[PDB]
Amino acid sequence: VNSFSGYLKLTDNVYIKNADIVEEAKKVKPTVVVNAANVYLKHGGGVAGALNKATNNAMQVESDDYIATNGPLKVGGSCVLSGHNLAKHCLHVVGPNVNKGEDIQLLKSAYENFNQHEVLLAPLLSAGIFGADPIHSLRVCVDTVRTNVYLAVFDKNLYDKLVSSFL
């Protein structure tokens, strides 16, 4: 039993809700919140911009030190950093950004990072400003993640379509 509330159950391990991931994290304080990161950990917009703003830019400060030490992530890769006031940890995961021409096949690799964590709050990778088809992202999520994932979808219209079209 966990404290996630109001989710629709899609499969044995995948759950979905129309929610603002910032507000969900603040309420639940999950062990792991997933960020829709880029390889530079520049949290300027999209989910990343919103999560960072909610930390009063502390996420960005920590991220800049991470990059200065380690260099950029790989597309499809991840790193674990602090969750600040939102979660114990933040798993920064880089899905391909179609608006950069990045291989959508890397979306499965991106979701594989979730399997290193027993329970996560997460957005649909490569959705929103990363330009991928959110229906496809949900399919890859369900077919790749085996741990318990609670998916937050900001846009109410898109959520209804993901549910209604889910196979």
Ligand SMILES: Cc1nn(C)cc1[C@H]1CC[C@@H](CO)N1c1ncnc2[nH]ccc12
């Ligand atoms: C814009 C945007 N850019 N990216 C990378 C994702 C999004 C939006 C669109 C689709 C949805 C994916 O779950 N997503 C969010 N979902 C939940 N909380 C959120 N807070 C802020 C954004 C957001």
